RNA sequence: AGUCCCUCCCGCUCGGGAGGGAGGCACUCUGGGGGGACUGCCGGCGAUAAGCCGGAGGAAGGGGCGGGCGACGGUAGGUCAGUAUGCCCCGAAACCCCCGGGCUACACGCGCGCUACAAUGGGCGGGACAAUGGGUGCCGACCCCGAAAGGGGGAGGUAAUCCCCUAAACCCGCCCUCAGUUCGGAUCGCGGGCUGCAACUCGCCCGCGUGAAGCUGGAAUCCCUAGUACCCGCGCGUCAUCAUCGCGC
């Protein structure tokens, strides 16, 4: 249940939430009230560029 | 300085790379060749009665098929 | 601020926008005479009917002419005194009514200076402002080479209306002058044949380029 | 009389504009909430600025100091329902910058997604990354 | 001489004069703040706009009437600039207008006919028609033309 | 009590206007036609009645109703409308060629409509299409 | 005391030819008729792009139904009422008869 | 529209307006049928033919104007991921359901656009005039509440009847006076709403605050011949909600 709205009684209990391929842990804090739990178990990997490949210019076609 | 005024009498064919000059026989009004028939190339659209003024009289031009 | 005398004006005679006549107005130039219209009336305002017709723009008023001419961007494709002039949005394209405004605010500062009827005045610019001899182009060897040849009177008007109107417009453009005081000014110089005046120099520089390639 | 600084809330304020225009060079105020507020304090917007005497700037200070209970509705304040005391407030300069950074901070502490956004310099509400929002130098093939 | 004889801006500018002596006309306590509409960017500049709002409110009814608040809200919107996006028609609010008929039935100008909308009362035809009478007297002086209508 | 209707068109407006023995009052939609705005369709109105004289004007009273169309569509349809009444009214011939030599559209009309539009950017125009690429 | 007629079809000429055997129905009697109104006619229009792929320049299809409308009213008279309610439409033409 | 009855207004009413009722089909409109334009008339050129050029009259003049309809074939052009279908494969997974993710990532190259770089303007108050289409799982007038977005009741409508539906550019008055500004409105903070079973990833709307690049664009290159191009808004499709798009006005 990605769509959970954190709620006080929640407080101090760790959750672990399904982000597409395994669930992570979440220590739930105080000022974490009033929001969604998906919004602390990121789906996507952050981006590091390589190297342009062959038809990223012009003149590589 | 002023130039000339002649008067188109006749209208004889388009020529230029693109088909954008006429060429015309016009007749001298005023001047010292008052009077004499000559050819001459133009721009732009002209019929038959217009007035063109030359800045000279003794130029004409080569005539076409 | 406008006097409701002028917010409410009434005309009772044919004459050009119900304020000044053309009946004393003559034209010096022999080949421009029968091109330029003066026929009495009272809108300049023909609804677009003459362009139909092979010539038909010849009897057309020549206020209406002008504003025609002038409702424009001005300086689309070209280059106007150095600079593209790209307003799109904030132009004067099919707005008649605005235009109609600017040219009758014109007329009365150019009344107000000189003391002469504006359509006199006007008729003298388009005078200085006709060129008289042109140039074609020929290509020989990947180089563009320039050929003297000379100008009919349609051109001639045609010619002489557009690079008035370019003045002016170049001369309000980002600039604390409005456009009613451009046109004024540009129509004042060309009647004086200063330099000044971008129609003025521009026939010159023509001129100039076409004697020196007879 | 006529000044042309006049200094109000610890900003100068241009003694020629207008006052309405004037006010909002500090930060924190716009144009609509100094219209309230010049309405607010029986002064004439359209007045020049120059001519404020010491206690008409008196005046303005302290209904910059509480807007809401001097008259202001409290759905024009820039922080109606503050995170912490629950009041609604309008902060100006310094105050109003610290809370914005302290606002992001938290947010940055419980390690939320819009937290991370914060801190990578990417952007927050949604928007597609693509094509546009590129600044940087072109890479070679 | 009626309403129609007589330019719209100037029946207003004089009538919303005119409606500072009647007593149930009073601008409420939210008037100080707020934009006549979403499609709006800055507060009103006249200290006075309520009796140009109500002068023209009256008007409107005179000529259109019977009508109701959603075709008035069509009335007073206007195109909206929307940051990159294409400019857009919009409504106004309702709040203005709605208070503003009451005030007006409270003074007796206009009345209400069931599922129809609002009208103009005698009372108010009468007051409008004075206004646009001396006006054209003060009018005509200046465009003869005007004697014949 | 004679009493003459005529009908002018000028794309999508229509007019309906009728002339009787009066004092000289004309009146378009219930106003005066002296205060219509702006200028250059107040001036659109008028013409005809210049052309006809003031011995004419002031022996006649028009009310004209006019829908559809713009603030110049509609202009001109009156004024078309107004042009016919006048010359049916008083029945004379050398007003008749007096208006076709100044403007032939006052007694002919305008028949000119919009063209539809067509697909490749439909909602500009008919002819108006989208910027081409190659590369 | 008067009966409404309204008919609709997608053919223009059945619909006159049932309009005249009315019409025929009410002058072989004595009967006032409010004689056949048109009114305006309903069209449909649809357009479709014409390529199944995606592939090709942009072309379309626009696809057209008409439909004709008619309304006749008269009075009701028993000897003229069986007589127009005995009378069979083609399988193209709709007809509806109320009493107003 | 003319004629008649009643009511209400103004300069007090000779005169001039606005509603309602009787009454009419005149005018507009709607839609069936018919007329009208044929190089027919006139003068030239060409051959004396086919035709072309220029005039009258005319609502219209020389395919009258705008559309539909694309020959025999080729392109081994696109489509088996709309449907039809041969062969080859999977056939307890390559078939059928459910939950959560993704197609929305972001040093960078390119196409098509929208908003601007201001006075041929920005703001505030006031005044004008459309057409195409659509509506019962829906269109909703009219009244009430709220600053707004919105909330609570709800006539009429299966529609030439009721509703969407009192467009914007335009005009009049006042403020700003050539400035990164009262130009521009990207980015972000706080708060309030709607649709939906669900709004974080990843929706749309409103109020206050914040205030980035941009001062007219190199070499190159696109569209358009008349109610056309430019400028300005609107309807339908998609659609529970969402239009910088498509097709039309
Ligand atoms: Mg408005
Ligand atoms: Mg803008
Ligand atoms: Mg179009
Ligand atoms: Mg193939
Ligand atoms: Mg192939
Ligand atoms: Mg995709
Ligand atoms: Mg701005
Ligand atoms: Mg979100
Ligand atoms: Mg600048
Ligand atoms: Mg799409």
Known sequence: CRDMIVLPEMVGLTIYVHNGKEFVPVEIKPEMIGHYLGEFAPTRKRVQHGAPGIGATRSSM | DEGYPAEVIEIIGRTGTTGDVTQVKVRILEGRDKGRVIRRNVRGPVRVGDILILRETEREAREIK | AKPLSERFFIPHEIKVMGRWSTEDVEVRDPSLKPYINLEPRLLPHTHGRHAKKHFGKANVHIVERLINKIMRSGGSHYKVAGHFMRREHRSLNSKKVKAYEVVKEAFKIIEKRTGKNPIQVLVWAIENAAPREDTTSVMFGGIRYHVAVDISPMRRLDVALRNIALGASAKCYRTKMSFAEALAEEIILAANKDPKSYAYSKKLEIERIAESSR | DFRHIVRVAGVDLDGNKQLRWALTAIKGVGINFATMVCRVAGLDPFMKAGYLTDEQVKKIEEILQDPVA???????????KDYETGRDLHLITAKLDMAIREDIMRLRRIRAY???????????????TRSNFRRGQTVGV | ATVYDVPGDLLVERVAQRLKEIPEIKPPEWAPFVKTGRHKERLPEQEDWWYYRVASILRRVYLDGPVGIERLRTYYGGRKNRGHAPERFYKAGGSIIRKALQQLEAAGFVEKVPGKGRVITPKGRSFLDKIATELKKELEEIIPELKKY | MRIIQTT?????????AVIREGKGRVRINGKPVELVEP?????????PLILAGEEIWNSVDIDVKVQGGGFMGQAEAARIAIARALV???????????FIKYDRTMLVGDPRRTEPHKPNRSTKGPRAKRQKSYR | QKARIKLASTNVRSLEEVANQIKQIAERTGVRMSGPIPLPTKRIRIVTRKSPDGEGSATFDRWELRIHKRLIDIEADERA???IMRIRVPEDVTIEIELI
């Open chain 4, 70 to 80: 001097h008259g202001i509705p409290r759905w024009a304040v820039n922080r109606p």
């Open chain 4, 114 to 128: 819009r937290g991370i956004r914060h801190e990578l310099g990417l952007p927050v509400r949604g928007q597609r």
């Open chain 6, 8 to 16: 002018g068109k000028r794309k999508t407006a229509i007019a309906r």
């Open chain 6, 39 to 47: 200028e250059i369709a107040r001036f659109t109105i008028l013409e």
């Open chain 6, 88 to 98: 049916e009214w008083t029945g004379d011939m050398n007003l008749k060629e007096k």
């Open chain 7, 81 to 83: 009422m069986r007589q």
